Amino acid sequence: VIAMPSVRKYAREKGVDIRLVQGTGKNGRVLKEDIDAFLAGGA
C-alpha cells in the first residue's frame, strides 16, 4: 500500500527520498506536508 503516486512524484521533483521522510507515518500514511517538511527543515 505504498503512498499515492501524486505524492511520490513531488518528492522526485525537488529530489527527496520519501523513505527517509518521517512525518505521521513513513508508509502508506505519508502526507503531502510530510515531504514538504523534509526539505524545509534544511539542515
What is the experimental method?
NMR
Closest by Cα among 24, 21, 19, 25 to 36: 21
Question: How far from 42 is each of 10, 21, 28, 38, CA to CA, in Å?
Answer: 17, 13, 24, 8
Closest to 20 (Cα-Cα) out of 9, 6, 37, 4: 37
The full set of domain ranges for the chain reads 1-43
Q: SS3 string of the chain?
A: CCCCHHHHHHHHHHHCCCCCCCCCCCCCCCCHHHHHHHHHCCC
CATH of 1-43, one of 3.60.15.10, 4.10.320.10, 3.40.50.150, 1.10.3210.10: 4.10.320.10
> Grid coordinates 518528492 are at which residue?
11
